[PDB]
Amino acid sequence: SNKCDVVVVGGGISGMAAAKLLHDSGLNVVVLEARDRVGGRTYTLRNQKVKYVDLGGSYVGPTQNRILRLAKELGLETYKVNEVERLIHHVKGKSYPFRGPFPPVWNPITYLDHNNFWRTMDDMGREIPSDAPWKAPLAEEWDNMTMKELLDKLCWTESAKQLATLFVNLCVTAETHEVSALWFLWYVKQCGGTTRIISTTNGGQERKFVGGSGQVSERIMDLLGDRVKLERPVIYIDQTRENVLVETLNHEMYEAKYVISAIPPTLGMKIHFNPPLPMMRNQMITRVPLGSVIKCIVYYKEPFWRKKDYCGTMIIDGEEAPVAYTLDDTKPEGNYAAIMGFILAHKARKLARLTKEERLKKLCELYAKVLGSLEALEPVHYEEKNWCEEQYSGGCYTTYFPPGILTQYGRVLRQPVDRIYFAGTETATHWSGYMEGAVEAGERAAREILHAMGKIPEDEIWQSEPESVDVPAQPITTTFLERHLPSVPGLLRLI
Amino acid sequence: SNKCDVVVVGGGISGMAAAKLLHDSGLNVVVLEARDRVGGRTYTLRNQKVKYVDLGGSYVGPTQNRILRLAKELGLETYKVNEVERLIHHVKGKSYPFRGPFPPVWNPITYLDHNNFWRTMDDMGREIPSDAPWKAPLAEEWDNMTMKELLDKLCWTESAKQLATLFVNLCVTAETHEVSALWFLWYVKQCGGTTRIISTTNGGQERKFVGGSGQVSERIMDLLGDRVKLERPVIYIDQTRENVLVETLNHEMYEAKYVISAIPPTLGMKIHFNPPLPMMRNQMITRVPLGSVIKCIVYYKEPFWRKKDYCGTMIIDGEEAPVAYTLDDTKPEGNYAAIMGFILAHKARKLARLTKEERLKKLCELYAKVLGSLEALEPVHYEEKNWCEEQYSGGCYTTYFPPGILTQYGRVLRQPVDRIYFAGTETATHWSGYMEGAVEAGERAAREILHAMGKIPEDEIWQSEPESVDVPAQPITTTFLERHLPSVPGLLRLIGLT
Ligand SMILES: *[C]C1=C([C])[C]=C2C(=[C]1)N([C][C]([O])[C]([O])[C]([O])[C]OP([O])(=O)OP([O])(=O)O[C][C]1O[C](N3[C]=NC4=C3N=[C]N=C4[N])[C]([O])[C]1[O])C1=NC(=O)[N]C(=O)C1=N2C#C[C]N([C])[C]C1=[C][C]=C([C]N2N=NC3=C2N=[C]N=C3SC2=NC3=[C][C]=[C][C]=C3O2)[C]=[C]1
Fold this sequence. Notes:
Two copies of one chain form a homodimer.
Chain A: E1 2-3, E2 6-9, H1 13-24, E3 29-32, E4 44-47, E5 51-54, E6 59-60, H2 65-73, E7 78-80, E8 86-91, E9 94-98, H3 108-125, H4 139-143, H5 147-154, H6 158-172, H7 181-189, H8 194-198, E10 207-209, H9 214-224, E11 228-229, E12 234-238, E13 244-248, E14 253-256, E15 258-261, E16 272-274, H10 279-284, E17 293-299, E18 310-316, E19 325-328, E20 338-344, H11 345-351, H12 356-371, E21 381-386, H13 405-409, E22 420-422, H14 435-452, H15 480-484, H16 488-493
Parallel strand pairs in A: 1-14, 2-3, 2-15, 3-11, 8-18, 12-16, 15-22
Antiparallel strand pairs in A: 4-5, 6-10, 7-10, 8-9, 12-13, 13-14, 17-20, 17-21, 18-19, 19-20
Helix pairs in contact in A: 1-9, 1-14, 2-14, 3-7, 5-6
Bound molecules: a molecule of 2 linked components (FAD-A1IDI).
A molecule of 2 linked components (FAD-A1IDI) is lined by residues 9-15, 32-35, 40-42, 56-59, 101-103, 114, 118, 163, 167, 170-171, 194, 197-198, 204-205, 233-234, 262-264, 267, 270-271, 293, 295, 315, 325, 387, 392-393, 396-398, 424-425, 433-436, 438 of chain A.
PDB class: flavoprotein
Keywords: MAO, oxidase, flavoprotein
Assembly: dimeric
């Protein structure tokens, strides 16, 4: 067997961040990666037509200090996603340009309803501990309903219900009726709330990495060298002996003092355990699916939308549109002009039956309508990735919790199993679901092992992160009217 | 490599029924079983204190003609679960003895609400094709709500809502808020409806096998000899070459023309596939958990409850009760007196924290109260099994579908993947979730391979089953009043109009 201090299962950002921290502390680490590549739910494709493109995770922004610090240490830079010109909200077949993070509403009843919906998501979040959502005072009540039931209760207008539905679908690549309300409310709150999660400027979509996010995982593989084993899917972990035995599909055996599991929780199912997992983890890993998305990038000769004072952001209501949300994916140099869109949740499942060229025509005709431009019908290139097809991801962006699961099983996600510690973005407490959460979780799991070895004290397991100097956060603000305007039933109780 | 015609992955009833049919048809089969035993979600424990006891699937009944026929051919016999004396409904800390499959309701409004709840479950069921529930006219609407939401809409009384909650928990070892309404309505209708699924006499719980249900899988292993490979968990299936390659954890390689997957759908995740599964199956197998249950059998010197004119059936409402449902588990000879109970859904997770002795004490204290009998505090023996802990089951009794899954993914549950065909009870169209469904699915998968091989015509893939001559099925009937009494809102509409 190949002997080491710690085996890390999975070479995404979380496992690479964990392996780098342990390597830097002087331990002998091995990363066992199932694929022929690192990066996992990040994947940067290079070719002459695109230069580089993120086909998985891409965006970073203020308050994501860990991924920013790790990337800066690896020699990466960010650039700002284009938000200079107007955003578009496409409603009932017409484009309404706007500025600021939130699409405006003009009907007074619809305004109260929209204002109350976002506000209420944040008010509910204030009662949900980031590190223990199952401790919310109404945890059971909120876990036992879907987001569809909560939206049906809160939204008195169809307008608000449709945009809230889009918000859920875009944030978690899942239908409102698939997900727990408690989990979804946790998810938003642990990203800093509604404004922070939805915003480009001053939010999660503010920036991308120059040359692609795949460079984070690639550059840690560059540091670790032949400590990273590609095409080594882990099939078996045996904790019955002095040292932990980890076996791969290609028959190799690794012996370590400890293991970090840095794979999506459900993909623990692909490992046979000796002894069997404890009951709660055995069932948890069958209850935690990942969402469904196709990430699609259409390339053009020029970022022609900018000539019409559009930035390239589109928020597109309704069932017919294949893509509900786009961003400008043009390089910072103004070349490789492109629109990124996501095909979300059931539409990913529905439109996967088409060919690549059929999806390209649907997207170009949608963009031509919404941008009001025939230039959208003249793509020069197309790239796409359907993450539903990935054996070693299960989906994207992240794991969602159906009703009832977070309260019954959530405590088990990061609980160690003997000498296995659990990383992966799903185990983070800030920007779980993101590259930021991957770094937080990988470094925390690594420090749990340094503590088990008696190398650091308990109080160093969870470490704060200084704010990025390059990507400072500005405060989230509200107006007096946003805070105090009544809900629709509130306006009615006054009548 | 060990070469054969068909590798069956899984030696539960479904895989063993598939392997037997293929063996009988003259093919070379191998069964690769992860555990050191066959039977899977069936397990008959033998010791001197119990003689035998089913700790997994046990009950069979009228309309389950495939399991009855298979067991009869293997030399097995059934006996009737004791339902001679009165049943008990325990609610708000008091016991109400009754006769018939349904606890009686005296309050007229509550009676309308109860009658309408069961009626409406079956009315909705008749809209749902057994072989394609996603084709129901309102499939999307029904799949996008939980059973909790459906009970909140239909039940105008708390009495009906509490009994309906117990019914869901007991039928599918899951909470009402965990499961799709479409999937639950399908599950009940594909068992023959509410009456058939809930009944002991004339329903699913009528009978057990003499000597235990594990004998089905064990007697098929006897017929197959060394073709059953125990402690061979399958890790890898490669379909890139002319013959399918199946690898086991203990390093062995099997080469076959076709594979039957006879494991619970999500346990397909334990297999690495080359090439990768198609997208829809790749995601489906992460979306389909199994339920949570501890099966607990408390033994007594005598079946003392019968002397109080109680048969041993208890329907126990209330969060404090660890067990919501019991049956008499006394042997047909009248000895090894015992009460079987289920610890359901969240209670299986909550009470797993206790010791075996702590669970025994809580069960005896509950039974003493429900039966009004101090003798219940004097157990002579105890056996239990928490199926949530089983790596190679995932839970019991069966796979449930959370909201939104059955319409989006259900079509691929038994869709072949190249030369992999899908057995397992979850793929049945009649008594899916049961030993009966396991036989249906195993034999149907085996016949899909016989058809692929040109040995049988397409119309022989799905085969009807003659009715058992030993276990006659009485029809499910309703009264005029059951059919035509209004719902509570129906009554309020008639009041508004008057
Ligand atoms: C895929 C993906 C995609 C496609 C995308 C994305 C993503 C993804 N993401 C994620 C990431 O990527 C993740 O997290 C990470 O990566 C993870 O990591 P980890 O943990 O490490 O993991 P992985 O990678 O997986 O790894 C693992 C590994 O392992 C391995 N394996 C397995 N198994 C195994 C193995 N090995 C060995 N062995 C075995 N067995 C594998 O292979 C691997 O490698 C992301 N992230 C980040 O960060 N970023 C990004 O970008 C991302 N992405 C996405 C994102 C998205 N988003 C955020 C969302 C959104 C968007 C937008 C928005 C906006 N909005 N919304 N809504 C709205 C808006 N706007 C405006 N408006 C609206 S509405 C409204 N209205 C109103 C009014 C008034 C007021 C208010 C309002 O509102 C949002 C969101």
